[PDB]
């Protein structure tokens, strides 16, 4: 059910943060939901601040849009930036001021694993073009769990590693030829890395693709809008086959078309 990205639609705002604390952040659903969660369970993390620990959890989409949280997790570890994902019942996030990825089982609220991403730059070393301590960007696609980062050895270019979702061991690593700080964000669809770059605060384009299957790179032009002029997060959800983004207090989704 895969294919290559050929179109990104216009943003649909699902919810707007109540306070300036939610100016940027990350919101997520589980592409492989596990009991007691479902494909509707939605997690939200406002990442404005210096000690981010609160994760808001909504059982229903209707609730995410108009109601209150079902549960609020207080993370044991401090969370960094907006690269986190939820996958198979666990929140995967980066420890504040570290290159450590943490697996946090949501239903038991237990940390199942913590692992340094070998050689990965962190806390401002290899951020996306706009900064934001976005050095490390987790991703989920049709094949499982990934991490997007860079190293001194890769010369600041985007590196991507397939991760073991249980213990976070790196299974395979790819080195691209695109400077990570040259793009505003990135995501993976069907084993292909796509990067997004911004001409302005409101105008963006999917501008580059790297196929992990062939190691073949390619330049693209797939325009789309940052309606609210400050996009801090853009991820792909392989279940819904849509892009989830956070844009200036607004949690939005994008329709896409695959070949
Ligand atoms: Ca991303
Ligand atoms: Na991410």
Curated annotation (Swiss-Prot):
Effect listed in the UniProt record for changing residue 222 to M: In GLC1A; uncertain significance
Query: What does the UniProt record report as the effect of altering residue 180 to E in this chain?
Result: In GLC1A; heterozygote specific phenotype
What, per the annotation, is the impact of changing residue 102 to M? In GLC1A; uncertain significance
The consequence of residue 18 to K is:
In GLC1A; uncertain significance
Mutating residue 2 to Y has which effect? In GLC1A; uncertain significance; forms homomultimeric complexes that migrate at molecular weights larger than their wild-type counterparts; these mutant complexes remain sequestered intracellularly
| Cellular localisation | Secreted
Q: Which cysteines does the record link by disulfide bonds? A: 2-190
Domain Olfactomedin-like: from-to ranges: 1-259
Identify this protein by name.
Myocilin, C-terminal fragment
The protein's organism comes out as Homo sapiens
Gene for this protein? MYOC
